Design a protein around this ligand. Structure first.
Ligand code: HEB
Ligand SMILES: C[C@]12CC[C@H]3[C@@H](CCC4=CC(=O)CC[C@@]43C)[C@@H]1CC[C@@H]2O
Ligand SMILES: CC[C@H](C)C[C@@H](C)CCC(=O)O
Length: 394
């Protein structure tokens, strides 16, 4: 309908598969050429510098999160205050570092179990065998939803972050058909689970959402569904890329792999530097709520504003050694989890999963990438990850 969400449409500067697999040199060039620019092919402003990206994310009154192509903004991701505040306050205490600490041993058990399934494999796909399943199992248990067919839910979860091949009408229609398929299955599935919990509450998050009251009324079914699908998709698609991207970097630069294996206290730094350097989410969308001058650029009420975390994370005004993977950084103020009121609810959980995933792989011993694979980027321009990544223990 040409009101298309620009975060789903690839920039024309990113063309080849090699560029999709490492777009950061191009973002860096764009940031230096013009840190804010209007892309005519996507009808949006792209923002590349750290200070302006942070400013946008910190100013929800100026830059709205209500960017659904449909009329209804369905989950807190797409809500502005005050509604955003009331719904997020329902769940914010479930996801703190203290709230999730008890899961550490259980997540270590899942990781050990998954790596046992590949101990006497020659090589294996880190995505299918480890990085994919682990976050799906964790988020399923937190939501309270059975997910025993992980491949099925992965397929449809992936559909919900898919983008268009280009800005053609046909490409957008193909993308919307994929996303529609994921909506049919995942919405249907959670509708059934919600009905089951309505009939018999359990000790799980879905049941809490059915019990909680906002303004003296229960959540609408649409509101509970929004939580379920957002938590499922955000909880697994990104984390899988965090783990895979870290394994990717550690096999592209074995110096880092060896140093962290030999000083495992560096794993939290490795997690943060993977987020900064290979961010699972490259770009965060907003809609200008009013006219806003960002420098000389005049952004008009209602225009799309795409903030490039992948570029901000390498802005040399903010980061020393921005294009170097450094596991000894004293601070790492990346925007890979966003910033401000929508700051990732799952960040403590993602950090724990990443820490455990990397630790278990490192403690199994040295590992290498299988050479002569043709990596396949995930087909969404706001995601950074590969569909498959084969490694082998030495
Ligand atoms: C569990 C769960 C979970 C998990 C695990 C996660 C994981 C993650 N994540 Fe998250 N998130 C989430 C859940 C989550 N998540 C939510 C729910 C949200 C929403 C919030 C609001 O909106 O407030 C987010 C949000 C978010 C954001 C912001 C956006 C805006 O601003 O709009 C970002 C960037 C992110 C990223 C991410 C990553 C990178 C990862 C990995 C690594 N996240
Ligand atoms: C936008 C999104 C796909 C569409 C999802 C959205 C979560 C909220 C949601 C509620 C539904 O009932 C399905 C459609 C939507 C609107 C998802 C959050 C991450 C994912 O990319
Ligand atoms: C699914 C992971 C996050 C909830 C989504 C954010 C990264 C926003 C993505 C966007 O702004 O289109």
């Amino acid at each position: 309908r040409e009101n298309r969400y620009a975060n789903l449409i690839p920039m024309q500067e990113i063309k080849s598969v090699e560029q999709q697999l490492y777009p950061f040199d191009i973002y860096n060039s764009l940031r230096q050429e013009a840190p804010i620019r209007y892309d005519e092919s996507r009808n949006c402003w792209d923002v590349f510098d750290y200070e302006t990206v942070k400013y946008i994310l910190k100013n929800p009154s100026l830059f709205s999160s209500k960017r659904a192509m449909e009329e209804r903004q369905e989950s807190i991701l797409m809500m502005d205050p005050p509604k955003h505040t009331k719904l997020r306050n329902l769940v914010n205490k479930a996801f703190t570092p203290r709230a999730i600490q008890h899961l550490e041993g259980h997540i270590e058990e899942i990781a050990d179990y998954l790596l046992d399934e590949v101990s006497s494999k020659e090589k294996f796909d880190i995505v299918e065998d480890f990085a994919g399943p682990l976050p799906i199992i964790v988020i399923a248990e937190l939501l309270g939803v059975p997910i025993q067919d992980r491949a099925l839910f992965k397929k449809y979860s992936d559909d919900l972050v898919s983008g268009a091949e280009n800005n053609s009408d046909e490409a957008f229609a193909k993308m919307m058909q994929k996303r529609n398929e994921g909506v049919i299955f995942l919405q249907g599935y959670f509708k059934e689970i919600i009905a089951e919990r309505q009939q018999n509450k359990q000790e799980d998050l879905i049941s809490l959402l059915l019990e909680a009251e906002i303004d003296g009324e229960h959540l609408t079914e649409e509101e509970v569904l929004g939580f379920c699908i957002l938590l499922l998709v955000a909880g697994n698609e990104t984390t899988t890329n965090l783990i895979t991207n870290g394994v990717r970097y550690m096999t592209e630069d074995v110096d880092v792999q060896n140093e962290v294996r030999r000083d495992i206290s560096l794993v939290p730094n490795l997690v943060e530097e993977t987020l900064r350097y290979y961010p699972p989410i490259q770009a965060i969308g907003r809609i200008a709520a009013e006219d806003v001058e960002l420098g000389e650029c005049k952004i008009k009420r209602g225009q799309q504003v795409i903030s490039w975390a992948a570029s901000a994370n390498r802005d040399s005004a903010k980061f020393e050694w921005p294009d170097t993977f450094v596991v000894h950084r004293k601070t790492n103020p990346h925007v890979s989890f966003g910033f401000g009121i929508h700051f990732c609810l799952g960040a403590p959980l993602a950090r724990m999963e990443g820490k455990i995933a990397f630790t278990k792989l490192l403690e199994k011993g040295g590992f290498s990438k299988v050479q002569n694979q043709s990596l396949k980027p995930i087909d969404s321009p706001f995601v950074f990850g590969v569909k498959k990544y084969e490694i082998a223990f030495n």
